[PDB]
């Protein structure tokens, strides 16, 4: 239930501003910069799973 809550929160986030999703939906077989953005955008606010 906390997973679902946090996921819909992330969904509302990625919906409210499309400019971040643009840098988040670029195609590249190694997205470790996008993974970094993940590790440095919500890591201090969300759970582990």
């Amino acid at each position: 239930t906390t997973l679902a809550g946090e996921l819909v929160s992330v969904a509302r986030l990625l919906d409210r501003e499309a400019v971040v999703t643009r840098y988040l939906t670029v195609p590249a077989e190694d997205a470790t910069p996008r993974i970094r953005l993940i590790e440095r955008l919500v890591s201090g606010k969300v759970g582990a799973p």
Binding site: R16, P27, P33, R36, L37, R40, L41
Partner: protein
């Protein structure tokens, strides 16, 4: 919700965090489109 204005911090973090190779997307009539190659 959304913590404010750290979003641009993470955006530039992504930009700066990234031998460059692009990939063809479209090709027709002697004109191609290439995704990637941020430093051309």
């Amino acid at each position: 919700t959304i913590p404010a204005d750290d979003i641009q911090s993470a955006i530039e973090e992504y930009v700066s965090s990234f031998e460059e190779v692009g990939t063809v997307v479209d090709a027709g009539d002697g004109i191609a489109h290439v995704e990637g190659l941020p430093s051309v």
